Specification:
The structure is cut from a larger assembly and holds three copies of chain A. In chain A, strands 2, 3, 4, 5, 6, 7, 8, 9, 10 and 11 form a ten-stranded antiparallel sheet that branches. Chain A has a six-stranded parallel sheet with strand order 15-14-13-16-17-18, with helices on both faces. Chain A is an alpha/beta fold. The longest helix of chain A is centred in the middle third of the chain and has 18 residues, at 340-357. In chain A, helix 15 links the parallel strand 16 and strand 17. The relative contact order of chain A is 0.10. Chain A has helices at 2-5, 42-52, 148-155, 171-179, 184-191, 238-247, 251-261, 316-321, 340-357, 440-447, 451-465, 471-484, 486-495, 541-556, 610-620, 633-639, 654-667, and strands spanning 7-8, 65-74, 93-102, 117-125, 128-135, 205-206, 211-214, 220-229, 267-275, 302-311, 334-335, 387-388, 531-535, 560-565, 574-575, 586-590, 625-628, 648-651. The structure holds CIS-heme D hydroxychlorin gamma-spirolactone (3 copies) and calcium ion (4 copies). Chain C: Residues 16-319 form the Catalase core domain. Chain C: GO terms for molecular function: catalase activity; heme binding; metal ion binding.
C-alpha cells in the first residue's frame, strides 16, 4: 500500500491551511459585523478556490464506474507459456485494483442502464504495472480504432439537446448500427441479459483482443483473456432495470461495496484460450478481428490464477476517479497483435490522461504508481512530485556512468516485441477481406441462447427500435437483422408495424457454442449476498416475531435480510415508503401481515398499494416469492399469484419454507412467467 | 535536505517506464530495418509525450531567478513584540528557501539587466509556511495593485514585435513613468547602482509594505522588514553589466551556486523597523504608502535573527522553478495593513499558481509543502496526491466528532486579524490625499548618494531616455524629473538635446538619510569569494611560476583565482579566448607575461589584443589592477594606466603585492576614474 | 485575411470589461479612503486574473523566435512532378507565415547565441495548410526521433542549477556529442558561421528530411527542400556575437522587423532537389538518413517559386 503512505488522517487536530497554519473556515472577514467581505481574507479564498477546482473531466467513455482493491494469485509456474513475472510461480501474489463501468453514460448516470460494461484490472507486478482493460462482452462493435468516435458519437446523446442519457434507444445509434454491420455481434450481446447484469460480481470480463504470450526464448502463442465469475452469471429483466435506475442509481457500486464489507469479496478465475500463431485464420475467421470469439469447442480455457476483490477504496476521487488505465502498460512476456482496434487504443489511453489530469505526471498519482523503482530520464512537467538526483538525464552518457542502462530481451529483463512478428506489403488504408463476415457469429450467439433468452433479446430490440423515429433507419435496421436471422427480423418488425424483408440465408446456420447463455448456465453456485425482503407489519406482534425467526434462518446462510414495516423500530430495517421490489432478489410476506395487501389498504405512511405492489412486481419480474405462516391463500389471491407456480412458496414451517425458498434464490429467475412469440 | 524524502536516485539500474516496466529508449520500433515507425511503440510515445510537456508557464513577473535552501536562526525570544512561533526563542532554527530574480525579463534573459530584483523568502515554520516576498529596493513604482498590469505592460517588450527584452529603455516604459509620478522613487533606485547589483549576495531585501506584528495579547505594532547583507553592498557599472549580459547571462545564479559550494554561503541580518500604530502618519507621509521609506533616523533597525543560505537545489525545475510564494502564507503573530498595493497582491499570488501548476494542488509539490501536519476539508482537484481518510469533510459535523476543530485567537494557535483594526466611511474608488507627494523622497534618495553615484544615476537616465523615440514622451519625462531636482533634469536634458523646464521648487530640499548609498557604505566587510584573474603566458616558465605563487597566496584569503593563458595546461584555468574583464573583480598581470600586452601581439588562439583588453577594461570599470614581479612599466604604458593611480599595484614581492591588492578588492571600485559633469 | 476579422481596435472609446460593461481600472474599491480592498471589486479581480494568466508554456525547443507574414508565388505549373495545388500554375500566390528561431535558449535568451536556427514556413493553401518546419542547417544531430530528448537535455542547461543558458559550451553537450557520433555533421555546421548568422534574412532554410512529391497518377519522386536566400549568406564573428548578445538581445527580430517596415522584405527561392525512388541508396549514403546532404554535384536545385516576407504581425503573442 503506496496508498497507505499517502493517507491523511483528520480524526484529531485543529483546522490548518494547506501550508500548515491553523485557521478557522466558518465566517468571512468583514469590514464591520454587517459589512462587505475583505479581499485580504486568505482563509476564504484558499477554501473556495479549492472547492471551485474540485472537478476534473470525466472519462470520454466509461465515465460511470466503481472500483476496489484486491489480489491476484497464480495457480502455477507459467514459464512454459509466458515470461510474465506475475505468473512465474505457484502461489505468487500480486496486488490488483479493478474498475467496473458502463460505456455511454456520464458520471451520475444510472448503473442499470442497458450497455456494454467495462472490467479494467491493474496488476501491480514486480516487473511493472500491467493493465488488462476489458469489457463484460467478448467482442467489440467495430474493426478499426479510427471509427471509435463515430461509434461513440452515435450512441451518446444527440448533440443539439443532449438527449437521451445512457441509452442506445434513439435514431443515431440504430443509424450507425444499421450502416456499420460489424456492430451486429456486440449489439446482440448488449441486447441480451449481458447488457443488464445483476451486478459487477455476476459478470465476466474479457480482454476482447487476441494478444501474445512470449516466452524468454522468444517463441509466442496467441491468447484471449477470460475472467470467469465465481459468483455465477445473472441478469436483471428490463422492466426491473428501468425502475432500479430511478430507485437506486448506485445499485452496482452499492452491491460491490457491501459484498466487500461483509467478507464476500467477489472472485474470478483468470483464464486464457491459447492457440498457435499458425491458427490465426484456422477457425473460419481472423484472430485479428475483435468482432469474433473463439468457440470454446475449438480452444478450451486454461485457468492461470485467482482474482479476488476484498477491500474498498478510502477516497473514491483519489483512487477510483484518478486510476488511469492503459493497454500500453504491458510487461515482459506479453505482446500485442495487429488487431487494428487494439493498435489505435495504444495511442488513445496515453493521450487522454493529459485531459483528465491536466498535466503529464499522471503516473505519479498514488493509485497509478508502480511498486518497483522507476529509473528514467523523464523530467519536469506540471505537477512534478520527484526531485531527480541524476543531473545527466540523457543517453548515451559518461557523466552518469551510462545509467540508466538499456533493457531488452538480453538485459535487465526488458520488454521486447515478439521476435517472430513481421509485416509485408503496401502501406494501405484498406480493410482485410478476412474481416467481412459480420453476421455468422451474431447468429451463433443467438442460436446458443434459451427460448426465453431469445425472447428477451427480441423484446430489447422491439423496445429500442420502436423509439427510433426515422422510418428509413427502422427499415435499414431490419435489413441488417434479417441477415443474422429472418425470425429475429420478423418478430422485431411485428412490434414496429413494418414488414421484414424476405429471408436471405447467406449467413444462416444452426450451430451453437457453450457458455454464452446466462439463463442456461444452471443455478447460481452461491446465494451469499442475495437480498431477501420480508414484508411485515407493526399491527400484529406475531408478524415481527415471524419476521425475526425467518431473519435468523436466512442470515445463517449469508443472505442479506431486510424486514420492511409501516414504521421503523427494533427488528425493522426499512419502511414501506422506501422499499421496492428492485431492492430484493426474493420477497416473503409473513402471514401476520395479510391485511396490508387488501385493495382498500391506505396509510399516510406509504403510497397506496405499496405492500402488494412490491410482491406483485417481484413475481412479475420472475423472482422467488412466498408467504410464510400457513394462512397463505389470501395474499396470493390479492396478488393473483398461483400457489402452485414454480418459484412461489407457501409453508407454515419456517425451516421447510427456507429450504425451498433458498433453492428458488439459486434458480434466481423463474422464466415460465414470461410470454413467448408463437 | 528537507526534501530528501522526494529524491529519486538513478545512479544504478535499468531504464524503466513511469510504471516500472524495464524498457529501452534509443531506437524506434519499425516495420523492417528501413521501415516506418509503428503506433504500438509505447516506449517512444511515453518518452516523447513527457518531453513535449516538460514546459510550464514562466512566472508573469520575476521569471528569471535562482534559489537556495538555508536556515534562519532567531537571536532572541521576541514574545514582547510578536506571537510568531519561529521568533519565540533564542537560537530557534527554521529551514528556509530563497529565490532571487529580476522583474521584467523572461526566464532566459540576462541576470545583469538593469531592473528591480526580487528577494523572496520562505520560512518553513512549526506553525506553517511564512513567506516574505520582497525586492532589493524598499519602495515600489505604484500605490494600488490594480495598476500592476499597467506598470508591467509598459516595461515589458512592445507587444507588436516583443522588443526590447529585459529593459526599461523604450518609449512605453518612460511614457508610463512620466504620466504616473508615483514611479519616481523606485525609478531613482533602479537607475542607481541598486539596479545592477554585483550579486544576489551583495544586495539587501525589503518587504516594502508596512505589516503588523501582533502579540498573543492582541496588541499590534507596525513593521517594515529589512534583510541586511553581511557581504556588503556592491554594484556593477553599466558598461560592464552590458558586456556581462552577453559573456555570462548566468552571472548571478553562478555566483550564488559557487559561493554555496565553496562553503561561503551568504548571510543577512533579518531586521525590522517597529513603530506604534499612532505613528502611521507621524513621519510626514503615510505608512500605508508603498512608495515611501521610513528614514532610519526616525526608526532604527532591530536585528531579529540570522538568514544563511548554504545548500543548492538538487533539481532546479522541481525546487526553484516550482516554488510558489504567496504573501497569503502568513502565520499567527503577523498581520496585513491597508496598503492598497499589498491588499491586491493577496489575491494575485493564489490565482497565478493555477496558471503555473495547471491545477489546484500546487501546495502538495515537495518545495511548497509545510513541515507540519495538514488538517482540512479541501478535497479532490487535478493532481490530488493525498488519500483522505475523513469521509465527513464538512463543518459542522458530528460524524467525524467535530474535527477538524476551528482555530482562532483563543484556541489552537489560530491566525487572527489584529483586533484593533477597524474601517470607516464610504465605499470608494478614490486615492488617499496622504499619498500625493511623489517627489520629496526621490529627492531625499538622490541627495543621499555620493557625487559619483549621482553621476552614475544621471548617466543611467541619459542612456535610457536617449533611446526613447517620442519627443513628447522625452519632454514629459523632464517635466517629472524636474519636480525632483532641477539639476537632474538639466544634466539629463543635455544628453537628449532638449532644454529642461524652469525649476519648480515645491518638493526641493537638502535632507539626507543614512544607508541608501552603495559607494558611501565603506570597504566591503569581506573579500571572500571575490574573483582575481591572473594574466600569464605559456611562453615563459617564469610567468607560470609567478602565477602559481600568486595563486597560493590569494587562495589562502578565500579569493577565487583564475589563471589565464594562451592554452590550458596544469595550473591554467582558462584561455584568453574565453576570458573577459567581466569575469574578475581584480586583474593581475605577471611580469613574465609582458610581451602579450604589445600592440603587434597576435595569435590564432585568441582575438587580437585580447590580453591587453582584459586589463584595460578592468581598469576603466574601476577595478583594482596590478603587475606582480617588479617590471611593471611596459604593461602599464601599453594600457595607458598611471603607476601612481589609486587601485593600481606594482610590487616585486608576492606578499607585499597581495597585502596591497586585497585592500583594493575591499575598496572594490576606484571611483576617481569616472568623469563628473561640470 | 482571417487575421483582419479578429482584429480589435482600441483607438477610441471607454474602458469595458470582457463582457462589454463600461468600467474604470485605476483605483481599488475600499472600505473608506484608507481602508481594506473589498472582495466585491469585480473590476480589480477580472483585470488581475487576466494578468495572472497571461503566460503560456514556451515551446519545448525553438522558444526564442520571431515571425512575419508574406506571400509565396509559384514560378510554373508543377503538375508534371506534384499534384500540390499551391504549385499548380505560373503566378499562383499563397499567403505564408514564417517563424525563425534558435533551438536551445528560453524565451528572453539572446538572438546571437551560437545555435542551429529554425526556419518554419506555413503555406495557407487552397487545399489546406502546409507547413515546412525546417532549419538553417540541412542535416540534423540524430538519426532517430526517440533520441530527441537526449540531445535536447544534453544541450540545455545542467538541470541542478540551470546553467548555462543558450549554449553548447558545457560538459553535458560535449559528452553527448562525443558518445553519439551521428552528431558530427550538424556539430561542424553549428561551429561554422552557420551557427551565428548575421540575420534571419542572410540564412537559408532546409526541410532536412527527404520527402516525396506525388503526382495525381500516384507516381512519386524523392525531394529535399532548400530555401535559398536572395540577400546572400553572411555571419557574425564569435567575439562580436558575444558582445551583441549583451548589447542587443533582440538583434535578429529587430533586423527582420526593420527590413520589412522599410520595404526591404526578405526573399528566398523555394527550391528542391528531385531524384528517383531508385536512387535512395545510389549516392553512397541512405536518403532516409537525416545526417546526410545530397551534394549539388549529384542533384541540382530546381527553383519552384518565390517566398517573400513583407508584413509584420499586429500582436506578437497572438500571431
Ligand atoms: C481509439 C479509442 C478507443 C478504442 C477503440 C477503445 N477505447 Fe477503451 N477507452 C478509450 C479509448 C478507446 C479512452 C478514451 O482512452 C478511455 C477513456 C478514459 C481512459 O482512461 O481511456 C477508454 C476507457 C476504457 C475503459 C475504462 C477504464 C477505467 O475504468 O478507467 C474500459 C474498460 C475500456 N475503455 C475498454 C475498451 C475495450 C474492451 C475496447 C475494445 C476492445 C475499447 N475500450 C476500445
Ligand atoms: C497585483 C499584482 C501584483 C503586485 C501589486 C505585486 N506583485 Fe509580486 N508578483 C505577482 C503579482 C503582483 C504575481 C503575478 O502573482 C507573481 C508572479 C509569480 C507568482 O508567484 O506571483 C509575482 C511574483 C513576485 C516575486 C517572485 C517570487 C518568486 O521568486 O517566485 C517577487 C519577489 C515579487 N513578486 C515581489 C513583489 C513586491 C516586492 C511587490 C510590491 C511591493 C510586488 N511583488 C507587487
Ligand atoms: C521528436 C521530437 C522532435 C524531433 C526529432 C524534432 N523536433 Fe522540431 N520540435 C519538436 C519536436 C521535435 C516539438 C517539441 O514538437 C516542437 C516545439 C514547439 C512545437 O510546435 O514543436 C518543435 C519545434 C520546432 C521548430 C520551431 C517551430 C516554430 O517556430 O514554432 C522548428 C523550426 C523545428 N522544431 C524544426 C526541426 C527540424 C528541422 C528537425 C529535424 C530535422 C526537428 N525539428 C526535429
Ligand atoms: Ca438520435
Ligand atoms: Ca490545463
Ligand atoms: Ca515601446
Ligand atoms: Ca553540463
Amino acid at each position: 500500500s503506496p496508498l497507505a503512505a499517502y493517507e491523511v488522517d483528520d480524526s484529531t487536530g485543529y483546522l490548518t491551511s494547506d501550508v500548515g497554519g491553523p485557521i478557522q473556515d466558518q465566517t468571512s472577514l468583514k469590514a464591520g459585523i454587517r459589512g462587505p467581505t475583505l479581499l485580504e481574507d486568505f482563509m476564504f479564498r484558499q477554501k473556495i478556490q479549492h472547492f471551485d477546482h474540485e472537478r476534473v473531466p470525466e472519462r470520454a467513455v466509461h465515465a460511470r464506474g466503481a472500483g476496489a482493491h484486491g489480489t491476484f494469485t497464480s495457480y502455477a509456474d507459467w514459464s512454459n507459456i509466458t515470461a510474465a513475472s506475475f505468473l512465474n510461480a505457484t502461489g505468487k501474489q500480486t496486488p490488483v485494483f479493478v474498475r467496473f463501468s458502463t460505456v455511454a453514460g456520464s458520471r451520475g448516470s444510472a448503473d442499470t442502464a442497458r450497455d456494454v460494461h467495462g472490467f479494467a484490472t491493474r496488476f501491480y507486478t514486480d516487473e511493472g504495472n500491467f493493465d488488462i482493460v476489458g469489457n463484460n462482452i467478448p467482442v467489440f462493435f467495430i474493426q478499426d480504432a479510427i471509427q471509435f468516435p463515430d461509434l461513440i458519437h452515435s450512441v451518446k446523446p444527440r448533440p443539439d439537446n443532449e438527449i437521451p442519457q445512457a441509452a442506445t434507444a434513439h435514431d443515431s445509434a440504430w443509424d450507425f448500427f444499421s450502416q456499420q454491420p460489424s456492430t451486429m455481434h456486440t449489439l446482440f450481446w448488449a441486447m441480451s441479459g449481458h447488457g443488464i447484469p445483476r451486478s459487477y460480481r455476476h459478470m465476466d470480463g474479457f480482454g476482447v483482443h487476441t494478444f501474445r504470450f512470449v516466452k524468454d526464448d522468444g517463441s509466442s502463442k496467441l491468447i484471449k483473456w477470460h475472467f470467469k465469475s465465481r459468483q455465477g452469471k445473472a441478469s436483471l429483466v428490463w422492466e426491473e432495470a428501468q425502475v432500479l435506475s430511478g430507485k437506486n442509481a448506485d445499485f452496482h457500486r452499492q452491491d460491490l461495496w457491501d459484498a466487500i464489507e461483509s467478507g464476500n469479496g467477489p472472485e474470478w478465475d483468470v483464464c486464457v484460450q491459447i492457440v498457435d500463431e499458425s491458427q490465426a485464420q484456422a477457425f473460419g475467421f481472423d484472430l485479428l478481428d475483435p468482432t469474433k470469439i473463439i468457440p470454446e469447442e475449438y480452444a478450451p480455457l486454461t485457468k492461470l490464477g485467482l482474482l479476488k476483490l476484498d477491500r474498498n477504496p478510502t477516497n473514491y476521487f483519489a483512487e477510483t476517479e484518478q486510476v488511469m488505465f492503459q493497454p500500453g502498460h504491458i510487461v515482459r512476456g506479453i505482446d500485442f497483435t495487429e488487431d487494428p482496434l487494439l493498435q489505435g487504443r495504444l495511442f488513445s489511453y496515453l493521450d487522454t490522461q493529459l485531459n483528465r489530469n491536466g498535466g503529464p505526471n499522471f503516473e505519479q498519482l498514488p493509485i497509478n504508481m508502480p511498486r518497483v523503482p522507476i529509473h528514467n530520464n523523464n523530467r519536469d512537467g506540471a505537477g512534478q512530485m520527484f526531485i531527480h538526483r541524476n543531473k545527466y538525464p540523457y543517453t548515451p552518457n559518461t557523466l552518469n556512468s551510462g545509467y540508466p542502462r538499456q533493457a531488452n530481451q538480453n538485459a535487465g529483463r526488458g520488454f521486447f516485441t515478439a521476435p517472430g512478428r513481421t509485416a509485408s506489403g503496401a502501406l494501405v488504408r484498406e480493410v482485410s477481406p478476412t474481416f467481412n463476415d459480420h453476421w455468422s457469429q451474431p447468429r451463433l450467439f443467438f442460436n446458443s441462447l434459451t427460448p426465453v433468452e431469445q425472447q428477451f433479446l427480441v423484446n430489447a430490440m422491439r423496445f429500442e427500435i420502436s423509439l427510433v423515429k426515422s422510418e428509413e433507419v427502422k427499415k435499414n435496421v431490419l435489413t441488417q437483422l434479417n441477415r443474422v436471422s429472418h425470425d429475429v427480423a420478423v418478430r422485431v418488425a411485428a412490434a414496429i408495424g413494418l414488414g421484414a424483408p424476405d429471408a436471405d440465408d447467406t449467413y444462416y446456420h444452426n450451430n451453437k457454442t457453450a457458455g454464452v447463455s446466462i439463463v442456461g448456465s444452471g443455478p447460481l453456485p452461491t446465494i451469499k449476498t442475495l437480498r431477501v425482503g420480508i414484508l411485515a407489519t407493526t399491527s400484529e406482534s406475531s408478524a415481527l416475531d415471524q419476521a425475526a425467526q425467518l431473519r435468523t434462518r436466512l442470515e445463517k446462510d449469508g443472505l442479506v435480510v431486510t424486514v420492511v414495516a409501516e414504521t421503523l423500530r427494533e427488528g425493522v430495517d426499512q419502511t414501506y415508503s422506501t422499499a421496492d421490489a428492485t431492492g430484493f432478489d426474493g420477497v416473503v410476506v409473513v402471514d401476520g401481515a395479510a391485511a396490508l395487501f387488501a385493495s382498500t389498504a391506505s396509510s399516510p405512511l406509504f403510497p397506496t398499494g405499496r405492500p402488494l405492489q412490491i410482491f406483485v412486481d417481484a413475481y412479475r419480474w420472475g423472482k422467488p416469492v412466498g408467504v410464510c405462516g400457513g394462512k397463505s391463500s389470501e395474499v396470493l389471491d390479492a396478488a393473483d399469484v398461483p400457489e402452485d407456480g414454480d418459484g412461489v412458496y407457501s409453508e407454515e414451517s419456517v425451516d421447510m419454507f427456507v429450504e425451498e425458498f433458498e433453492k428458488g434464490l439459486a434458480t434466481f429467475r423463474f422464466t415460465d412467467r414470461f410470454a413467448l412469440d408463437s
